[PDB]
Design a protein around this nucleic acid. Structure first.
Ligand SMILES: [Mg+2]
Ligand SMILES: [Mg+2]
Ligand SMILES: [Mg+2]
Ligand SMILES: [Mg+2]
Ligand SMILES: [Mg+2]
Ligand SMILES: [Mg+2]
Ligand SMILES: [Mg+2]
Ligand SMILES: [Mg+2]
Ligand SMILES: [Mg+2]
Ligand SMILES: [Mg+2]
Ligand SMILES: [Mg+2]
Ligand SMILES: [Mg+2]
Ligand SMILES: [Mg+2]
Ligand SMILES: [Mg+2]
Ligand SMILES: [Mg+2]
Ligand SMILES: [Mg+2]
Ligand SMILES: [Mg+2]
Ligand SMILES: [Mg+2]
Ligand SMILES: [Mg+2]
Ligand SMILES: [Mg+2]
Ligand SMILES: [Mg+2]
Ligand SMILES: [Mg+2]
Ligand SMILES: [Mg+2]
Ligand SMILES: [Mg+2]
Ligand SMILES: [Mg+2]
Ligand SMILES: [Mg+2]
Ligand SMILES: [Mg+2]
Ligand SMILES: [Mg+2]
Ligand SMILES: [Mg+2]
Ligand SMILES: [Mg+2]
Ligand SMILES: [Mg+2]
Ligand SMILES: [Mg+2]
Ligand SMILES: [Mg+2]
Ligand SMILES: [Mg+2]
Ligand SMILES: [Mg+2]
Ligand SMILES: [Mg+2]
Ligand SMILES: [Mg+2]
Ligand SMILES: [Mg+2]
Ligand SMILES: [Mg+2]
Ligand SMILES: [Mg+2]
Ligand SMILES: [Mg+2]
Ligand SMILES: [Mg+2]
Ligand SMILES: [Mg+2]
Ligand SMILES: [Mg+2]
Ligand SMILES: [Mg+2]
Ligand SMILES: [Mg+2]
Ligand SMILES: [Mg+2]
Ligand SMILES: [Mg+2]
Ligand SMILES: [Mg+2]
Ligand SMILES: [Mg+2]
Ligand SMILES: [Mg+2]
Ligand SMILES: [Mg+2]
Ligand SMILES: [Mg+2]
Ligand SMILES: [Mg+2]
Ligand SMILES: [Mg+2]
Ligand SMILES: [Mg+2]
Ligand SMILES: [Mg+2]
Ligand SMILES: [Mg+2]
Ligand SMILES: [Mg+2]
Ligand SMILES: [Mg+2]
Ligand SMILES: [Mg+2]
Ligand SMILES: [Mg+2]
Ligand SMILES: [Mg+2]
Ligand SMILES: [Mg+2]
Ligand SMILES: [Mg+2]
Ligand SMILES: [Mg+2]
Ligand SMILES: [Mg+2]
Ligand SMILES: [Mg+2]
Ligand SMILES: [Mg+2]
Ligand SMILES: [Mg+2]
Ligand SMILES: [Mg+2]
Ligand SMILES: [Mg+2]
Ligand SMILES: [Mg+2]
Ligand SMILES: [Mg+2]
Ligand SMILES: [Mg+2]
Ligand SMILES: [Mg+2]
Ligand SMILES: [Mg+2]
Ligand SMILES: [Mg+2]
Ligand SMILES: [Mg+2]
Ligand SMILES: [Mg+2]
Ligand SMILES: [Mg+2]
Ligand SMILES: [Mg+2]
Ligand SMILES: [Mg+2]
Ligand SMILES: [Mg+2]
Ligand SMILES: [Mg+2]
Ligand SMILES: [Mg+2]
Ligand SMILES: [Mg+2]
Ligand SMILES: [Mg+2]
Ligand SMILES: [Mg+2]
Ligand SMILES: [Mg+2]
Ligand SMILES: [Mg+2]
Ligand SMILES: [Mg+2]
Ligand SMILES: [Mg+2]
Ligand SMILES: [Mg+2]
Ligand SMILES: [Mg+2]
Ligand SMILES: [Mg+2]
Ligand SMILES: [Mg+2]
Ligand SMILES: [Mg+2]
Ligand SMILES: [Zn+2]
Ligand SMILES: [Zn+2]
Lengths: 141, 69, 110, 181, 53, 77
RNA sequence: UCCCCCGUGCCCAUAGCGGCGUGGAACCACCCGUUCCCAUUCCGAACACGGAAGUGAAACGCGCCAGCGCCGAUGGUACUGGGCGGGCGACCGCCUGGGAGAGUAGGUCGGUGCGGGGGA
RNA sequence: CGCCUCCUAAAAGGUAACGGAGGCGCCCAAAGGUCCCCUCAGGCGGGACGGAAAUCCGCCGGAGAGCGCAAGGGUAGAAGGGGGCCUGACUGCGAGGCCUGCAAGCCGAGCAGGGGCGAAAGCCGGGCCUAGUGAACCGGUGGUCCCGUGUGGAAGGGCCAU
RNA sequence: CUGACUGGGGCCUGUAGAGCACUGAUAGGGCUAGGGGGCCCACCAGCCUACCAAACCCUGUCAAACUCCGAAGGGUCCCAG
């Protein structure tokens, strides 16, 4: 599942989740989209569960585009140690996601299929979601 | 040129094996060489030196036509 | 993408301007040799001299010297004494040296 | 300047034929030889016996001009190269000397090459320059068997004011460079 | 400074006084330093020599 | 459990010490910097560590000459 | 005071790259030579001297063209000094003042100072 | 556990945590001063041994290379590369500042002495820069010839340098 | 009368935001060195790949120790309340 092949730094300070998404707000490849309604660190495992469920719905067919990527390392202190003695170990990777972002798109599939896969995928993600379909507003960006 | 580091060039005759003499310049006045452009096979038309063969092989054996038909 | 000539020119000129003197700049063509003394504070030429303008003769070096002398004379006439020699892209030698030496005989201070 | 046969041949035979062949509108547009730069990549003298004063001598006999040394721009492991090491010679022939060199290359050296079947047609730079390599220096009339400790070749760059290969082939060919195809 | 990069004094060869302290590498520069320096005593430049610190 | 980190150096208090329009005396330091972020201009010296300082009494002025860099001048009084 | 050129600056790419055209009377260059001054880790390529047969081919100057490069609104938004609200929170909104970056329209194949030389 | 560079640090300075990452405890007689000259990495094409990469030629190539070592800033209109002469890697001082609880640390025009380079303008009081360090006490060595326990010396000390 | 604070004016700055030109990360596609694999062969070259995939390009992104950009503010000096 998704993680950087290499990085300049092993650990990142946590930062903030303020604002609407910087970019990535319009459908850009496929026909239907899953857009984030609230901010979160989406984990690599959560992403992979969304993906796997979608290919599972399609059985064979369709194309899934994953548009968010987990490059933020997530740190945790070993169980039961006290505060201090330096930063915790990287235990996983997250993709920071703000409201408005198209996290996933699908193409090559019926409408009822794109809706359903995106719904099931939604249930794997720890935030609220909206399914969208490509508009002229998308195409003009 | 800088003085004292360069071999002086003077008029010089290179004498080839075809009996040609070339009036040029060298660090040596007279030179004898085994070959030159004037007599060299590649240069001289297309002097086919020792093998004017026409292959000769392979159809071209012809010893002979005496096997019957 | 500059050339040795453009770099060299800069490299010497920059070092001269830094001292703040009036700049005696010398241009040397294949045939002629020109000189202007420039105030870089004002971006203004104050005094000129050329072989071209003096309709001068033959041996380039001797000519140089003459324009040097000519330069100085119009120069002291204006109150100019001190100045800094801008050999530009030119080695200080030959025609330029000659130009310099003449401006020196003429009483220009450098 | 020297009257040398090849120089004359250029002005007399080659200049005109060329103008005919390409219809130049200006005398300066017709192709000239600019420089012949001879190089010895060597480096068999890296540490070993950097008495390649023997080669510098040989080269200076061939050209009538003393080569200057080339030394390594960077350190190299697998070739065993400390930076600053003397690994080659280069002599830049121009004008009269360039002509004399070529005169004898064309008349005598190339002929003496083993199994010579003509210069390479495709060694053209693509901006109208030509390059060719020799394997031995016994090719030149000035270097006899008696005088050589070891076989070493060289790189020859012939530089031309022509803009295109197509023009350069012409100049060099007309001058007498023998091409295999 | 190290066992090989040593400290040393320079002495007016004319007046014998040590006037400058400095350093050198004795593997790269085994010969005793000789430098022209201003001698404040002799009041002029004087060849100065490395003398043990 | 421990850190291999933990260190940092003293801050160096760098930057411009006198801004345009400010009156200065000869010797006043005008800029403290690493390398040449500002270059010495008219009536301005540069110390070995790139420190810009006033050569004469006067008023400071800054100048942005595009690709030529930025300059600190002191214009006499 | 206008036009061309030669120097030398300033603005610091709206000045650049590329393509095309153009100039040699003057000037500039290439050019012709390497005795002489000077010079090549080799080379009269460079630097340098002495020249004046040729050519504007190279270079340079001057024009033109928007493929690239560079510049770039207006509108709107992000964000925000200050003042208010809301949410358990992650966070979200309102008032007043300021206001980007991206992008769009569009612009650009420079402008100008001083001094020389030539022309009207 | 001291020192340097970056981030955290909220666009002046400063700013903590057993917060995130690295370095120093040297070095260079040139790797220093000055005069003069030169310009990179990399890509494509061309070239004997010769290769991804040795040296050579061509065209493109503003800096992505170099700058002894970490990092950052800086930098080809050189701080990079080559050469010639050199020792300013001065002595006596030092206007005025940076920084700052103190003590320290830092930058420094200018005058004098005697020099180096340069035709000159001028530059040179080490090194592109920021780490490469240690107060006092006690003592060593060279100098000075200042004190010398009634007096002349001497012992011993002061002073300058280390 | 010099103060906090305020008005005007200059200068300094690299954060918010944003961006991707640098350093790195990045999904997909295109183009295309390099391998894996399959035809065909050891005379050394060919050919085909819905395989992994460098550089480059396009679409779309990410960053305390990235910045082609870049605010609001802040600091400082001058005049004035
Ligand atoms: Mg935190
Ligand atoms: Mg979590
Ligand atoms: Mg955590
Ligand atoms: Mg902790
Ligand atoms: Mg942790
Ligand atoms: Mg996790
Ligand atoms: Mg987002
Ligand atoms: Mg859910
Ligand atoms: Mg966009
Ligand atoms: Mg070819
Ligand atoms: Mg050519
Ligand atoms: Mg022979
Ligand atoms: Mg000392
Ligand atoms: Mg530890
Ligand atoms: Mg830490
Ligand atoms: Mg501090
Ligand atoms: Mg601190
Ligand atoms: Mg710090
Ligand atoms: Mg500042
Ligand atoms: Mg200094
Ligand atoms: Mg320094
Ligand atoms: Mg201004
Ligand atoms: Mg001013
Ligand atoms: Mg002009
Ligand atoms: Mg002008
Ligand atoms: Mg002006
Ligand atoms: Mg024409
Ligand atoms: Mg043109
Ligand atoms: Mg003419
Ligand atoms: Mg004519
Ligand atoms: Mg002679
Ligand atoms: Mg004579
Ligand atoms: Mg010549
Ligand atoms: Mg002539
Ligand atoms: Mg032309
Ligand atoms: Mg020119
Ligand atoms: Mg814009
Ligand atoms: Mg607006
Ligand atoms: Mg508002
Ligand atoms: Mg607020
Ligand atoms: Mg507003
Ligand atoms: Mg902004
Ligand atoms: Mg804008
Ligand atoms: Mg137009
Ligand atoms: Mg343009
Ligand atoms: Mg005019
Ligand atoms: Mg310490
Ligand atoms: Mg800070
Ligand atoms: Mg900061
Ligand atoms: Mg700060
Ligand atoms: Mg702040
Ligand atoms: Mg302070
Ligand atoms: Mg600790
Ligand atoms: Mg450590
Ligand atoms: Mg040296
Ligand atoms: Mg140095
Ligand atoms: Mg030197
Ligand atoms: Mg190259
Ligand atoms: Mg190659
Ligand atoms: Mg080969
Ligand atoms: Mg090669
Ligand atoms: Mg670099
Ligand atoms: Mg290291
Ligand atoms: Mg001397
Ligand atoms: Mg003080
Ligand atoms: Mg203090
Ligand atoms: Mg002196
Ligand atoms: Mg003096
Ligand atoms: Mg002298
Ligand atoms: Mg001084
Ligand atoms: Mg150094
Ligand atoms: Mg240092
Ligand atoms: Mg110290
Ligand atoms: Mg004690
Ligand atoms: Mg004690
Ligand atoms: Mg004591
Ligand atoms: Mg007594
Ligand atoms: Mg006494
Ligand atoms: Mg007694
Ligand atoms: Mg007695
Ligand atoms: Mg006594
Ligand atoms: Mg006695
Ligand atoms: Mg005593
Ligand atoms: Mg004593
Ligand atoms: Mg003392
Ligand atoms: Mg008042
Ligand atoms: Mg006040
Ligand atoms: Mg106040
Ligand atoms: Mg105010
Ligand atoms: Mg941000
Ligand atoms: Mg990027
Ligand atoms: Mg883009
Ligand atoms: Mg962020
Ligand atoms: Mg930051
Ligand atoms: Mg940032
Ligand atoms: Mg303010
Ligand atoms: Mg203000
Ligand atoms: Mg008041
Ligand atoms: Zn023959
Ligand atoms: Zn003395």
């Amino acid at each position: 599942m998704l993680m950087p092949r290499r990085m300049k730094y092993r650990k990142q300070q946590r930062g903030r989740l303020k604002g609407a998404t910087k970019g990535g707000d319009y459908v850009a490849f496929g026909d239907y989209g899953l857009v984030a309604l609230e901010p979160a660190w989406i984990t690599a495992q959560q992403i992979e569960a969304a993906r796997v469920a979608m290919v599972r719905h399609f059985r064979r067919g369709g194309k899934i585009f994953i548009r968010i990527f987990p490059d933020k390392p997530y740190t945790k202190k070993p169980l039961e140690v006290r505060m201090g003695k330096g930063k915790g170990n990287v235990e996983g990777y997250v993709a920071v996601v703000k409201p408005g972002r198209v996290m996933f798109e699908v193409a090559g599939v019926t409408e009822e299929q794109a809706m359903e896969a995106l719904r099931i995928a939604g249930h794997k993600l720890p935030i609220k979601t909206k399914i969208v379909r490509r508009d002229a507003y998308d195409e003009a960006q | 040129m800088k003085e004292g580091i360069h071999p002086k060039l003077v008029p010089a005759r290179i004498i080839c094996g075809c009996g040609n003499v070339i009036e040029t310049y060298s660090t040596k006045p007279e030179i004898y060489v085994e070959v030159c452009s004037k007599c060299h096979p590649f240069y001289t038309g297309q002097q086919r030196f020792v093998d004017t063969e026409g292959r000769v092989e392979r159809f071209q054996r012809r010893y002979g036509d005496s096997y019957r038909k | 993408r500059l050339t040795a000539y453009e770099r060299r020119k800069f490299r010497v000129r920059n070092r001269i301007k830094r001292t703040g003197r009036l700049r005696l700049s010398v241009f040397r063509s294949l045939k002629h040799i020109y000189a202007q003394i420039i105030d870089d504070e004002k971006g203004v030429t104050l005094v000129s001299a050329s072989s071209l303008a003096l309709k001068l003769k033959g041996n380039k070096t001797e000519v140089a010297r003459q324009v040097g002398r000519a330069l100085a004379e119009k120069a002291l006439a204006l109150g100019i004494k001190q100045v800094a020699f801008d050999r530009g892209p030119y080695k200080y030698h030959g025609r330029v040296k000659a130009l310099a030496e003449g401006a020196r005989e003429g009483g220009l201070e450098f | 300047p020297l009257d040398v046969a090849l120089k004359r041949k250029y002005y007399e035979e080659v200049r005109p034929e060329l103008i005919r062949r390409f219809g130049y509108q200006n005398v300066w547009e017709v192709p000239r030889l600019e420089k012949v730069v001879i190089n010895q990549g060597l480096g068999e003298a890296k540490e070993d016996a950097r008495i390649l004063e023997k080669a510098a001598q040989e080269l200076a006999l061939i050209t009538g001009q003393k080569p200057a040394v080339t030394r390594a721009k960077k350190s190299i492991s697998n070739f065993k190269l400390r930076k600053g090491m003397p690994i080659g010679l280069r002599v830049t022939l121009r004008r009269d000397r360039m002509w004399i060199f070529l005169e004898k290359l064309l008349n005598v050296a190339l002929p003496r090459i083993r199994d010579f079947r003509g210069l390479n047609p495709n060694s053209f730079d693509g901006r109208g320059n030509y390059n060719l390599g020799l394997r031995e220096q016994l090719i030149f009339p000035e270097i006899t068997y008696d005088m050589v400790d070891a076989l070493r070749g060289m790189d020859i760059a012939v530089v031309t004011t022509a803009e295109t290969d197509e023009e350069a082939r012409a100049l060099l060919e007309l001058l007498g460079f023998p091409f295999r195809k | 400074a190290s066992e090989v990069r040593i400290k040393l004094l320079l002495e007016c060869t004319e007046c014998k006084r040590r006037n400058y302290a400095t350093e050198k590498n004795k593997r790269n520069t085994p010969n005793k330093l000789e430098l022209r320096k201003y001698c404040p005593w002799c009041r002029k430049h004087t060849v100065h020599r490395e003398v043990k610190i | 459990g421990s850190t291999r980190n933990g260190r940092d150096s003293q801050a160096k208090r760098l930057g411009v010490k006198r801004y345009e329009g400010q009156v200065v005396r000869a010797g006043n330091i005008l800029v403290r910097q690493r390398g040449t972020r500002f270059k010495p201009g008219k009536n301005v010296g540069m110390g070995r560590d790139f420190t810009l300082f006033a050569l004469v009494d006067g008023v400071v002025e800054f100048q942005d000459r595009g690709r030529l860099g930025r300059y600190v001048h002191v214009r006499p009084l």
